[PDB]
């Protein structure tokens, strides 16, 4: 989930934008 | 700001800046 993708590894725009409504 | 480790409030702030008026979901586990 996000923590894995963006906290414990380096985040990206691609991935963050998936969580937008 | 997005291309780094983003945790806690720093993550939530990145989500807010990227998503703008869309909003988002932050779901830790």
Numbering used by the authors:
A (entry chain A): 1 to 21
B (entry chain B): 1 to 29
From the study:
Insulin, a small peptide hormone, is crucial in maintaining blood glucose homeostasis. Insulin consists of 51 amino acids in two peptide chains, the A- and the B-chain. It contains six cysteine residues (Cys) forming three disulfide bonds, two of them link the two chains and one intra-chain bond is found in the A-chain. At micromolar concentrations it self-associates into dimers.
We have previously observed that introduction of a Cys in position B25 results in exclusive expression of a covalent dimer insulin precursor (see experimental section) whereas substitution of other positions in the dimer surface with Cys led to negligible or no expression of insulin precursors. The structure of the B25C-dimer was determined by X-ray crystallography and refined to a resolution of 2.0 Å. The crystals belonged to the cubic space group I213 with cell dimensions a = b = c = 77.9 Å with one monomer in the asymmetric unit. The dimeric structure was formed by applying appropriate symmetry operations. The crystal structure reveals that disulfide bonds were formed correctly with no disulfide scrambling and the two monomers were linked via a new disulfide bond formed between the introduced Cys in position B25 of each monomer. Overall, no significant conformational perturbations caused by the introduction of the additional disulfide bond at position B25 could be observed. AUC analyses showed that the B25C-dimer oligomerization pattern resembled that of HI and that it was capable of forming analogous hexamers in the presence of zinc ions. The dimer was found to bind with markedly decreased affinity compared to HI (IC50 = 0.0012% relative to HI in the same plate, n = 3, SD = 0.00008%). However, significant improvements in stability of B25C-dimer relative to HI were demonstrated by markedly slower processing of the precursor with ALP, an almost 40°C increase in Tm, more than 44 kJ/mol increase in ΔH in DSC measurements and no fibrillation in ThT assay. Our results underline that the dimerization of insulin is responsible for insulin stability, while the monomeric form is required for this hormone's activity.
